[PDB]
Amino acid sequence: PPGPPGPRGPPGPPGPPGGPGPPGPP
Amino acid sequence: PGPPGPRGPPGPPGPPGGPGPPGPPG
Amino acid sequence: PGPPGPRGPPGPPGPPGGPGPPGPPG
């Protein structure tokens, strides 16, 4: 029969950097 | 011996990215 | 029984990071 199911793949790579912060105070 | 087992599932989503750059001057 | 299946593929890229730090004062 078929062998045991394989291991789960690796976690994906880190997401991209976030957007820019809000503008500073007036 | 039988054929190789079914392939494992895909990994989970990666970790979130880092924070974005500093915002613009007020 | 056959050999265990191959490891799954890498997961999706992680989510985008958070917002950056607030910008400097006007």
Residue numbers in the entry:
A (entry chain A): 1 to 26
B (entry chain B), C (entry chain C): 2 to 27
What does the primary publication say about this deposited structure?
Collagen's structure involves the assembly of three polyproline II helices, with each individual chain consisting of a three residue repeat sequence with the general form (Glycine–Xaa–Yaa). Within collagen's trademark triple-helical structure, three polyproline II helices are stitched together by a network of interstrand hydrogen bonding along the central axis of the right-handed triple helix. The triple helix is stabilized by the backbone NH groups of the Gly residues acting as hydrogen bond donors to the carbonyl oxygen of Xaa position residues in neighboring chains. To gain atomic level insight into these new rules we present two high-resolution crystal structures of collagen triple helices, with the first peptoid-containing collagen peptide structure.
We solved the structure of the CMP 25, bearing the Xaa position NmetG residue, with the sequence [H–(POG)2(PRG)(POG)3(NmetG–OG)(POG)2–NH2] to 1.15 Å resolution. In addition, we have reported two new collagen crystal structures, with the first structure of a collagen triple helix containing a peptoid residue. In the NmetG structure, the void in space observed along the surface of the triple helix in the Val structure is filled by the N-methyl group of NmetG. This prevents the NH backbone–water interaction from occurring and better protects the Gly Cα from solvent exposure, with the nearest water being positioned approximately 3.7 Å away from the backbone NH and approximately 3.5 Å away from the Gly Cα. If there is any other residue present in the Xaa position, this average drops to 3.4 ± 0.2 Å. These observations are consistent with our structures, with the NmetG residue blocking solvent to a greater extent than the Val residue. Beyond solvent exposure, the identity of the Xaa position residue will affect the backbone dihedral angles of nearby residues. Averaging φ angles of Gly residues from collagen structures in the PDB gives a value of −69 ± 5° while averaging ψ angles gives a value of −176 ± 5° or 173 ± 5°.32 In our structure, the Gly residues adjacent to the Xaa NmetG residue adopt conformations closely matching the PDB average Gly (φ, ψ) angles with average values of (−68°, 176°). Comparing these angles to other structures in the PDB, the Gly residues next to NmetG adopt conformations similar to those adopted by Gly residues adjacent to either Pro or Hyp residues.
